[PDB]
């Protein structure tokens, strides 16, 4: 495996942390998280989404075909 | 204990270290604080006070971590807090 101490060259990047026990766990938990959310949604429904209202779609008319065409039928037999 | 008796002894020879503990001494304690009573409270000492004083300040207490150089193998904040405390303690 790879070793903290022998990863990669790192040079000229400053890192600024807080304590646990000094900051909270959830801040503006739904004030900045519902926001974000949202967001990210928009950024994913268009290629998410789509495919699978096609595959509603075809999942409706299909079992609707079916029922139609076998049972509900006997349309007429007409003597 | 000896290490700071000596300590305390070998800083203050000369005019120039006993000047700046007078001129700071006041500023700090307001009054000199001679050798013996400094002394007296090395003396009082003992394994308790230090478990107990030690204790006070450094167990289970949240750090301050400053970090310059070839870092990447500085353990993590967190690591580095669980290191203030002993689980079998």
Same mark, same amino acid.
């Given at each position: 495996g790879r070793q903290f101490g022998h990863l990669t060259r790192v040079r000229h990047v400053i890192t600024y942390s807080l304590s646990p026990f000094e900051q909270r766990a959830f801040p503006h938990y739904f004030s900045?998280?519902?926001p974000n959310v949202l967001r990210r949604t $928009?950024?994913?429904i268009l290629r /998410?989404?789509?495919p699978? /209202?096609?595959f509603?779609? /075809?999942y409706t008319w299909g079992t609707q075909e079916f029922e139609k065409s076998k049972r509900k039928n006997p349309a007429a037999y007409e003597n | 204990k000896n290490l700071l008796?000596?300590?305390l002894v070998s800083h203050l020879d000369?005019?120039?270290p006993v000047c700046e503990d007078i001129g700071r001494s006041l500023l700090t304690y307001?009054? $000199?604080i001679p050798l013996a009573e400094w002394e007296s409270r090395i003396a009082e000492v003992d394994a308790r006070v230090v478990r107990e004083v030690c204790s006070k300040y450094f167990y289970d207490q949240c750090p301050a971590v400053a970090g310059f150089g070839p870092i990447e193998q500085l353990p993590d904040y967190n690591r580095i807090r669980s290191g203030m405390f002993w689980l079998r303690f």
């Open positions: 900045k998280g519902i $928009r950024a994913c /998410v989404a789509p699978f /209202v096609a509603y779609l /075809v | 008796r000596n300590a000369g005019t120039t307001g009054r $000199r």
